[PDB]
């Protein structure tokens, strides 16, 4: 029964034909549980280790690596020698990273938990029903339990489905919604039916919802609803159903390695035609196994050298180092892609209360009736100091000073404070402070009157702990609250029924002190009261009320106003039906206006810098609150969101006005609107999707489970430090201190990390383009390989990977927050950058290529070969040019190989330099801008020399210590790298403004 809180509870029983008295028959419970199956949420999809194994090599330019370690494995097995001593490390190491890679990837998902599962904390394992077959109550698992059944629950117990209340065993029932409603204040609970078909939850006083909690009280119900039909299952289903995309960077990444696919394939179909010649030879003659040989060999090292290997642990480092240091600012990212994501935040939706306020409330202002005579009329306004909960404070008129009980009219204004109120103070001996206990509004309240003391109470003796309730306790020796009329959303009020401590056999002196929004108790007025004397409500004071309430609250005072009031004359006990909270209004009529209390949630003091911030870096801003339309706009104004004279008749609306709004009209609404009020429970996400559909990377904040479909859909969910588990699990970043303020940081921080991990990333890729050229190169020329898989792993990984790191750190520009949004779309390189790194690719190619073939020739140490042309011949089968001798196999010679990889790490470790900035020049932004960058180079070369001297290791990637010329060589061809750069920096710098 979907709409079981409109329906009587005669109705709900009528409808599943079962009696509250016995309950469901076994057949019935039968029939129940095969119509609407079991009580529980789904569970999550049984993903297996080997399907997640299995996944790890899903993606193309891991699945290329497995391809070229099964050639490198076919080749280190169909070769012929004594080189036992080492011939499979090429496959090993390849495999070894695919399977180091596929581990961590292992690892993270068992690591990882979703929000959907994190909901399951909220239904308990059992519930106590009442059944046919059985006189008593019978708890049974939770998960048996059906529409239709009688439940039992009391205080403590989990709520384990949705439930319409039948009848409430104890004096009355408070249940703790906070989870599903916000409303962290236990609430009173009734029977009787609600009428608006489409109320929303908080209005449904008649149901207790799946995985809510009672805080009092006991009561007998009927299921309505279970499984997925309960609000929090509806809230999963939602969730489930809420597809996040991959982060901008993700999909260029994803991008870039289709694109490699497809180069990478198109390269060996290069090698294959620039050597078509081949069919011109004999068929007789030569090897044409050491010819497949060769080139299954350079597939292999173009596979390894187009794949920057190292770039995701690159990647992953700097996140999880600037994770890391965003925590040090209260911004706890849970995902690391979504640091990127942050960067671009485009709009940031924030609720108001907590985050952009203090939540500390405090009373400000507040005025009784002076005067009234005839037309005439005047007002007694009063000011009060002490923005804390603390009695520390006094109340003035006109910053003067006075006593409170001076005026009559003030002592029954705070006599309506003190007793319609549930909350209280209480010293924290501990901080040191005086907390809050229960609503913040009531407690404000409570505070006042504490300052107001109009009984000249002797607080100056009392300790800390005695001062907190020391003049609202005075108030309630002078009055016996018999009963209280909660307050409710419909109007907006609360009261409660008193009568006097010492008085006899009397059957007069009964009152009802009212508190609630203006508008709706002054309507209810027919009397004002004025000191100790009462006239009748006219026109002229009304007028002159609502108009200094107009002021207060939607003026730069920006107040949240309470009219208070008694109805002198309420009507006799007996003759009050304190069960329907629909009669309430009723009761709290013909009532006599005592006075308005107007009370300040502060703004954080970073605030209003922080909505700076976001105009400078084009970030808009969107206050979400429970306020009323016209306070929400005059915070609005009071902050920054809105300018203090600006229009924004379309730029504001109520959850209401938004709804009678038409498909077309709401999303039109949201790409100018900047203020959301009395929002209902599903705008949150449809305010998201209207935002996607414009583009923009959005951040909305939340704190409940029914938050969590929001924050699921946008970009950037945002949870509470002090919010659920729930709403944390489904948010990309958590605020350990709620503030509105740490957003900005983070979105700054943000574009800070990014910046640098764009320098990083061309850098890594731009050794990947050179490395192809000399694989290409050397394939095309038919020489002999430059560089082998083995080393261009190690530059991949090590050399260039400690550069590539430190570059995460490069110093951020300061004009950071003075731009707009990055487009998610920009691309990494493209344009003239583009050109460079096809010059300095093609560069890298024949400084390697180079390198090696000058060794093979104009090198003393090795065959002085000068125009010999290694080309020429690679199997000495005829050996035509050797007219005598006994070897042939230098054209293995570690020499070469370790000319072109020396070059190759010196060139990179110039070519991180030219990497500090895209396109100022190193004379503008010197090397030692960044320490990091220096101490890597150094780190690098050293590792370089490790490998050439420490015997293992030489041995392993074929290289041989160079010689003080051969390293001289390696400099000449290298450092000029610095300069074709800075020439083409200089081009992009004076000839492509614009
Ligand atoms: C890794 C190494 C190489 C050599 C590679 O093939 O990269 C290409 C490639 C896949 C792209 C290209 C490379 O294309 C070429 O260099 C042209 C072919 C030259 C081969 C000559 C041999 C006969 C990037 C690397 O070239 C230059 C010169 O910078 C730039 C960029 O990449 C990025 O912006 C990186 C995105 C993370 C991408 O055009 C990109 O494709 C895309 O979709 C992009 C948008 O991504
Ligand atoms: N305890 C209370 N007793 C009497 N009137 C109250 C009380 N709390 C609030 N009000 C009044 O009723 C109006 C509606 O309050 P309500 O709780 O629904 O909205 P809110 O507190 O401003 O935001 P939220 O929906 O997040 O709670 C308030 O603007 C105020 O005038
Ligand atoms: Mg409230
Ligand atoms: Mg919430
Ligand atoms: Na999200």
């Given at each position: 029964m979907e709409a079981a809180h409109s329906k009587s509870t005669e109705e709900c029983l009528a409808y599943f034909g079962v009696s509250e008295t016995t309950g469901l028959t076994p057949d019935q419970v039968k029939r129940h549980l095969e119509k609407y199956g079991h009580n529980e949420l789904p569970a999550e999809e049984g993903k297996s280790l080997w399907e997640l194994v299995i996944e790890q090599f899903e993606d193309l330019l891991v699945r290329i690596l497995l391809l070229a370690a099964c050639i490198s494995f076919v080749l280190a097995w169909f070769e012929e020698g004594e080189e036992t001593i080492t011939a499979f490390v090429e496959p090993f190491v390849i495999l070894l990273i695919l399977i180091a890679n596929a581990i961590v990837g292992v690892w993270q998902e068992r690591n990882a938990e979703n929000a959907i599962e994190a909901?399951?904390?909220?239904?308990?394992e059992m519930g106590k029903v009442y059944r046919a077959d059985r006189k008593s109550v019978q708890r049974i698992k939770?998960?048996?339990?059906?529409?239709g059944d009688i439940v039992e629950v009391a205080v403590g117990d989990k709520v384990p489905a949705d439930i319409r209340i039948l009848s409430i065993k104890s004096t009355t029932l408070r249940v703790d919604q906070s989870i599903l409603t916000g409303e962290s204040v236990s609430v009173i609970k009734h029977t009787e039916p609600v009428p608006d078909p489409r109320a929303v939850n908080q209005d449904k006083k008649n149901m207790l919802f799946s995985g809510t909690n009672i805080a009092a009280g006991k009561a007998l119900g009927i299921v309505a609803t279970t499984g997925v039909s309960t609000e929090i299952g509806k809230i999963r289903d939602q969730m489930a159903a809420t597809e996040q995309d991959k982060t901008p960077l993700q999909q260029k990444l994803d991008e870039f390695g289709e694109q490699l696919s497809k180069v990478i394939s198109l390269i060996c179909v290069a090698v294959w035609l620039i050597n078509i010649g081949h069919f011109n030879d004999p068929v007789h003659g030569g090897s044409w196994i050491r010819g497949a040989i060769y080139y299954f060999k350079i597939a292999v090292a173009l596979a390894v050298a187009a794949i920057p290997e190292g770039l995701p642990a690159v990647i992953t480092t700097c996140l999880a180092l600037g994770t890391r240091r965003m925590a040090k600012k209260n911004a706890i990212v849970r995902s690391l892609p979504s640091v990127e994501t942050l960067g671009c935040t485009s709009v940031i939706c924030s609720d108001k209360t907590g985050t952009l306020t203090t939540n500390q409330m405090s009373v400000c202002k507040m005025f009784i009736i002076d005067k009234v005579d005839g037309d005439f009329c005047s007002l007694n306004e009063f000011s009060i100091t002490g923005s804390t909960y603390a009695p520390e404070g006094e109340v003035l008129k006109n910053d003067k000073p006075i006593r409170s009980g001076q005026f009559d009219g003030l002592v029954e204004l705070a006599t309506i404070c003190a007793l319609c109120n549930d909350s209280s103070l209480d010293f924290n001996e501990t901080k040191g402070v005086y907390e809050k206990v229960g609503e913040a509004t009531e407690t404000a309240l409570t505070t006042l009157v504490e300052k107001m003391n109009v009984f000249n109470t002797?607080?100056?003796?009392?300790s800390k702990v005695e001062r907190a309730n020391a003049c609202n306790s005075v108030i309630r020796q002078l009055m016996k609250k018999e009963f209280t009329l909660e307050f409710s959303r419909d109007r907006k009020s609360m009261s409660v029924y008193c009568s006097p401590a010492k008085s006899s056999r009397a059957a007069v002196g009964n009152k009802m002190f009212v508190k609630g929004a203006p508008e709706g108790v002054i309507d209810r007025c027919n009397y004002v009261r004025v000191g100790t004397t009462r006239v009748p409500m006219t026109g002229p004071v009304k007028e002159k009320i609502l108009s200094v309430i107009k002021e207060w609250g939607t003026g730069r005072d920006t107040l949240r106003c309470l009219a208070l009031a008694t109805r002198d004359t309420p009507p006799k006990?007996?003759?009050?039906?304190?069960?329907?909270?629909?009669?309430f209004m009723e009761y709290e009529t013909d009532l006599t206006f005592v006075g308005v209390v107007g009370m300040l949630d502060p703004p954080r003091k970073e605030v209003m810098g922080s909505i700076q911030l976001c105009r400078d870096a084009g970030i808009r801003v969107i206050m979400i609150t429970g306020d009323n339309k016209g306070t929400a706009i005059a915070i609005c104004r009071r902050i920054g969101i809105f300018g203090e004279n600006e229009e924004v008749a379309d730029r504001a609306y109520t959850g209401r006005e938004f709804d009678d709004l038409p498909l077309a009209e709401q999303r039109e609404a949201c790409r100018r609107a900047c203020c959301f009020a009395r929002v209902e429970p599903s705008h949150k996400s449809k305010i998201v999707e209207y935002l996607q559909s414009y583009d923009e990377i959005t951040a909305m904040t939340g704190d409940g489970v029914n938050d969590a479909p929001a924050l699921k859909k946008a970009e950037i969910g945002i949870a509470m430090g002090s919010g659920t588990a729930v709403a944390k699990t489904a948010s990309e970043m958590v605020l350990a201190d709620d503030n509105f303020s740490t957003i900005v940081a983070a979105v700054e921080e943000g574009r800070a990390i990014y910046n640098n991990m764009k320098q990083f990333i061309r850098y890594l890729i731009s050794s990947n383009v050179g490395e192809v050229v000399c694989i290409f190169l050397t394939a095309a020329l038919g020489l002999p390989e430059a560089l082998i898989p083995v080393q261009l792993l190690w530059v991949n990984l090590v050399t260039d990977g400690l550069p590539a790191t430190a570059l995460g750190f490069n110093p951020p520009d300061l004009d950071i927050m003075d731009r707009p949004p990055r487009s998610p779309k920009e691309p990494l390189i493209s344009g003239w950058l583009f050109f460079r790194y096809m010059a300095i690719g093609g560069y890298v190619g024949a400084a390697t290529v180079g390198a090696a073939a000058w060794w093979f020739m104009y090198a003393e140490d090795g065959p002085g070969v000068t125009y010999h042309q290694l080309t020429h011949f690679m199997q000495c089968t005829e050996d035509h040019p050797h007219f005598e001798g006994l070897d042939c196999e230098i054209f293995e010679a570690p020499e070469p190989m370790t000319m072109a990889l020396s070059v190759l790490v010196t060139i990179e470790m110039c070519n991180a330099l030219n990497s500090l900035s895209e396109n100022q020049s190193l004379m503008r932004?010197?090397?030692?801008?960044n320490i990091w960058l220096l101490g890597s180079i150094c780190l690098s070369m050293s590792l370089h020399f490790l490998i050439l001297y420490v015997d293992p290791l030489p041995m392993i990637f074929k290289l041989k210590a160079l010689d003080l010329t051969q390293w001289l060589m390696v400099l000449k061809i290298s450092l000029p790298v610095i300069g074709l750069d800075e020439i083409l920096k200089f081009i992009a710098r004076n000839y492509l403004e614009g």
């Open positions: 909901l399951k904390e909220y239904e308990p939770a998960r048996d339990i059906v529409p002797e607080v100056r003796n009392l006990r007996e003759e009050m039906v304190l069960d329907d909270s629909s009669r932004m010197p090397p030692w801008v």
